[PDB]
Design a protein around this ligand. Structure first.
Ligand SMILES: *C/C=C(C)/C=C/C=C(C)/C=C/C1=C(C)CCCC1(C)C
Ligand SMILES: [Br-]
Ligand SMILES: [Br-]
Length: 264
């Protein structure tokens, strides 16, 4: 069903993928420790945004770990190359994980935007439906990446419509609420929008790899793109959300935030 299953891999290709996925685990778990220790400097109003970064680190780090183990289970070194054994490797589990991690990424943004009550709950609801629509339709599409490329493209067009609408809700909420933001974070949150547009677009590029690069090297490329994108969309994004949360905390008078920032 997935293109990974069609090829044998050289030692270099096989090991590089293994290292990519392992480094990703280490990066997410290292970040998790940082987000954990820094959360005591966040005011109550934003503390959940930093907690959600911890939740995303574990979720993504578990999926990467699980992908790495599945990669080594599925392939063994036989007659000069890594060849498929009885177990199967696939990217489908990443899509299932997005069902949880994308809502979390969107909720931390809504929190640092100072949204609350009814606006918060309704914005989050529409965002979560649009995200699930994107992820489900892309999940279905990738089932056809070996059997029916045309079907992969069409499901990907549907998925892209949900993506574009989700980004429009995000941009609309960022550009409208920029002005409520304290401590100069009105400037930083704009960079957050651009980081998301960039980093999230890596995923659909990766989804199209079976169409424009259907071979072992394309398999490597796809893993590399997911790694750059996971890091950018989860770790780098989380660092910027945390910075915005602490800065707004300090500007609103939360003393542990002022002292943390004071001592660096
Ligand atoms: C941390 C994981 C993140 C931020 C994953 C984001 C995933 C997407 C933006 C997926 C987008 C897709 C399309 C827009 C079309 C092709 C199918 C998808 C689901 C890869
Ligand atoms: Br507060
Ligand atoms: Br994830």
């Amino acid at each position: 069903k997935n293109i990974e299953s069609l090829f044998d891999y050289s030692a270099g290709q096989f090991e590089f993928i293994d290292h990519l996925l392992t480094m990703g685990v280490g990066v997410h778990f290292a970040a998790l420790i940082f987000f954990l220790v820094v959360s005591q400097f966040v005011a109550p109003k934003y503390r959940i945004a930093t907690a959600l970064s911890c939740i995303v680190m574990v979720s993504a780090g578990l999926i990467l770990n699980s992908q790495a183990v599945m990669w080594t289970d599925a392939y063994a070194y036989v007659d000069g190359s890594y060849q498929l054994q009885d177990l199967t490797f696939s990217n489908g589990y990443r899509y299932v994980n997005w069902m949880a991690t994308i809502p979390c990424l969107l909720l931390q943004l809504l929190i640092v935007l100072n949204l609350k009550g009814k606006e918060l709950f309704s914005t989050a609801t529409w965002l979560i439906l649009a995200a699930w629509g994107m992820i489900i339709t892309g999940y279905v599409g990738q089932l056809y990446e070996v059997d029916d490329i045309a079907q992969l493209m069409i499901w990907g067009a549907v998925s892209t419509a949900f993506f574009v609408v989700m980004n429009w809700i995000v941009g609309t909420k960022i550009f409208k609420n920029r002005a409520t933001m304290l401590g100069g974070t009105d400037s930083t949150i704009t960079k957050v929008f651009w980081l998301m547009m960039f980093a999230w677009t890596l995923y659909p590029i990766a989804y199209l790899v079976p169409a424009f690069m259907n071979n072992a090297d394309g398999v490597v490329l796809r893993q590399l793109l997911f790694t750059i994108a996971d890091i950018s969309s989860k770790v780098i994004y989380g660092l910027m959300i945390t910075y915005i949360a602490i800065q707004q905390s300090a500007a609103a008078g939360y003393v542990p935030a002022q002292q943390a920032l004071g001592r660096i």
